[PDB]
Design a protein around this ligand. Structure first.
Ligand code: HEM
Ligand SMILES: C[C@@](O)(CS(=O)(=O)c1ccc(F)cc1)C(=O)Nc1ccc(C#N)c(C(F)(F)F)c1
Length: 426
């Protein structure tokens, strides 16, 4: 259960802060000094490398993320979508999402409580993925997928294959090619239909609370076809649930072998929310220790391990001449595991993020940094606190003997094993 990132870690440690590599069968330079991270990520002068993102824009010759918000590299084209889409992420937009967050988390916990007999194995990876998908579908596009309740099996199956498609396409077979193409076309069709269903409600003068769909449509205002829209549809559908689910899955997985931390987490949910059923916005800020545990989870287990920038002009980086036209790779996974940046890096220790501790300085970036940072950071941090808070209040988890703690790389990092647990009530 090692990943290509673990090899980059070995080389960063051994060959220093500037290392030429092969990723996606392409030359790049991995750059792992905090000073280089600041200089390149913190300036609008450096932009994403279209070359490295082509594997999201299209897969197996089927259009996927296209020139959506993640995969668009040109600053001006990106800046135009971002300025608009940003509105759906205001403090007030996010406050409004609390209900969706509580509703899905509650439904999750209820489903789990029904299986909490200590004998039924439950894939926490699958359940968390269904939750995150149901949350995203509702919060972003105003649709109920009810995957938690067994619905939309074809859609979840389509996301699954598509993800494996992204996995096979850039790294490594007859049916897979067909399945993946079909899955990508199904996803884009799903988006067609949900855009239509929104348009027809609007056509009949119905009222629509501003959301992500509202701003994606709005950014597509004046285009002859809606292919840009479906790009942004698939972008958010995927990016707005997969990393959250992976992050939750890693956190649950790790906590199963951290009883003392669970005890403090439990003690904390009690003090701040009690046995209350609904979490208020202001409740989130007070779950400070849960916050540290999630931060520490992202340090060791970042679903999105890093990012690429195009270095346009030959530049000196930490004493090494790097030629112009070179993709720079930045890895929060790598830096998180280097003892030069984090003491005893392999130890899961949430006190690293405790009150009074200096904040890691450009050595930790699970949502990236600068202008290309994650638009959904706060959205994500909120949903996962809501979900974990409810789990911690009501349930205890035990990993099914034989479950491993390792990682795998699909389109993101996620647990190698499905996180099979048996459940008991707290
Ligand atoms: C804990 C979960 C999350 C983490 C770890 C996370 C991680 C990241 C990272 C590292 C970036 C940079 C990608 C790159 O440079 O190529 C990114 C991009 C972004 N993610 Fe997130 N993300 C998560 C949750 C969310 C959610 C919930 C949303 C949507 C609701 C979302 C939407 C976005 C989008 C659209 C981008 C592109 C931003 C831009 O270039 O303007 N993510 N995410
Ligand atoms: C194809 C690849 O899986 C591989 S990668 O190793 O070149 C890579 C991983 C993570 C990155 F942030 C950037 C690149 C990939 O680009 N995945 C990727 C990148 C960003 C995002 C975001 N946001 C996602 C996500 F699935 F949408 F979350 C996947």
């Amino acid at each position: 259960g090692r990943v290509l990132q673990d090899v980059f870690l070995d080389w960063a440690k051994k060959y220093g802060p500037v290392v030429r590599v092969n990723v996606f069968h392409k030359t790049s330079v991995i750059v792992t000094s905090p000073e280089s991270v600041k200089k390149f990520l913190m300036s609008t002068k450096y932009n994403k490398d279209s070359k490295m993102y082509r594997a999201l824009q299209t897969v197996f010759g089927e259009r996927l993320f296209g020139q959506g918000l993640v995969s668009e590299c040109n600053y001006e084209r990106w800046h135009k979508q971002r300025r608009v889409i940003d509105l759906a992420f205001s403090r007030s937009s996010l406050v409004s999402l609390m209900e969706t967050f509580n509703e899905k988390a509650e439904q999750l916990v209820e489903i789990l409580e029904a299986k909490a007999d200590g004998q039924t194995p439950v894939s926490m990876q699958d359940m968390l993925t269904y939750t995150a998908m149901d949350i995203l579908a509702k919060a972003a596009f105003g649709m109920e997928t009810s995957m938690l309740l067994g619905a939309q099996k074809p859609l979840s199956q389509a996301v699954k294959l598509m993800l494996e498609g992204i996995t096979a396409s850039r790294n490594t077979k007859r049916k897979q090619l067909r399945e993946v193409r079909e899955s990508i076309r199904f996803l884009r069709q799903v988006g067609r239909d949900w855009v239509q269903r929104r348009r027809e409600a609007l056509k009949r003068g119905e009222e629509v609370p501003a959301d992500i769909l509202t701003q994606i449509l709005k950014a597509e205002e004046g285009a002859q076809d809606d292919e840009g829209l479906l790009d942004n549809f698939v972008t958010f559908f995927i990016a707005g649930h997969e990393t959250s689910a992976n992050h939750l899955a890693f956190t649950v997985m790790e906590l199963s072998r951290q009883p003392e931390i669970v005890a403090r987490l439990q003690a904390e949910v009690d003090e701040v929310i009690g046995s209350k059923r609904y979490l208020d916005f202001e409740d989130l800020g007070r779950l400070q220790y849960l916050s540290q545990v999630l931060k520490e989870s992202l340090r060791l287990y970042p679903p999105a391990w890093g990012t690429f920038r195009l270095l346009e002009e030959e530049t000196l980086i930490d004493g090494v001449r790097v030629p112009g036209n070179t993709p720079l790779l930045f890895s929060t996974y790598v830096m998180g595991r280097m003892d030069t940046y984090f003491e005893d890096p392999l130890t899961f220790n949430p006190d690293r993020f405790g009150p009074g501790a200096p904040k890691p300085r450009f050595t930790y970036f699970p949502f990236s940094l600068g202008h290309r940072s994650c638009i959904g950071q706060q959205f994500a941090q909120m949903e996962v606190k809501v979900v974990m808070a409810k789990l911690l209040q009501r349930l205890e988890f035990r990993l099914v003997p034989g479950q491993r703690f390792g990682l795998q790389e699909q389109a993101t990092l996620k647990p190698l094993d499905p996180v099979l647990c048996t459940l008991r009530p707290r």
